[PDB]
């Protein structure tokens, strides 16, 4: 069922989503025993609104693996990219 999808979010001025999870993140509202990074909220009319959705699991960002990544490390990485953030996400279809 699940597929790895690639999307490009243009910071305008930010990505327009929140996340939960990661190593040390004490879980997420979707799959408690998955320690990965999950999108929790997408800003309507924001840069991610046609691309990402709550529940999506981010497993890569601009070539950097998000598998086994810590919670703050993922937040810092996403904050630090200055323009386009090409994401690979896992989504149930």
């Amino acid at each position: 069922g699940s597929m790895e999808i690639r999307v490009r979010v243009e910071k305008d001025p930010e990505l327009g989503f929140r996340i939960a999870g990661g190593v040390g993140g004490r879980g997420n509202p979707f799959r408690p025993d998955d320690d990965g990074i999950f999108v929790t909220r997408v800003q309507p009319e924001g840069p991610a609104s046609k691309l990402l959705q709550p529940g999506d699991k981010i497993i890569q960002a601009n070539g950097y693996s998000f598998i086994n990544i810590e919670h703050g490390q993922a937040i810092s990485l996403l904050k630090t990219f200055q323009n386009t953030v090409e994401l690979i996400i896992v989504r149930e279809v």
């Binding site: 930010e14 990505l15 327009g16 989503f17 929140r18 996340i19 939960a20 999870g21 040390g24 993140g25 004490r26 879980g27 997420n28 509202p29 929790t40 800003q43 919670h71 937040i75 996403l78 904050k79």
Partner: peptide, 7 residues
Amino acid sequence: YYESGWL
């Protein structure tokens, strides 16, 4: 669980 701010 811990949730980030808006990114």
